[PDB]
Amino acid sequence: LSLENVNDMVKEITDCESRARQLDESLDSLRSKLNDLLE
């Protein structure tokens, strides 16, 4: 791979890791709020 072909795929690693982390952290902290009402 060239340096640009790594530099634009590390961008789509980071841009997807950010949205996956925020969507997982907005899901487990919501499951906890669900269990706080089921309890």
Partner: protein, 50 residues
């Protein structure tokens, strides 16, 4: 207020009702399903992303 400092110390969550055992259940089931639908939205988005 000292029993509550025993309960809240070791992470016990007191549920005071003081109105009815049939009026809070409706307002709480109106939140269980309303938040379960947000689970079913965000987890569908998660499995779409994966």
């Amino acid at each position: 207020k000292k029993v509550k400092r025993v309960i809240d110390s070791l992470n016990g969550k007191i549920v005071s009702l003081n109105t009815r055992s049939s009026e809070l259940v409706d307002t709480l089931n109106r939140q269980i399903d309303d938040l379960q639908r947000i689970l079913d939205t965000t987890e569908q988005t998660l499995h779409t992303e994966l």
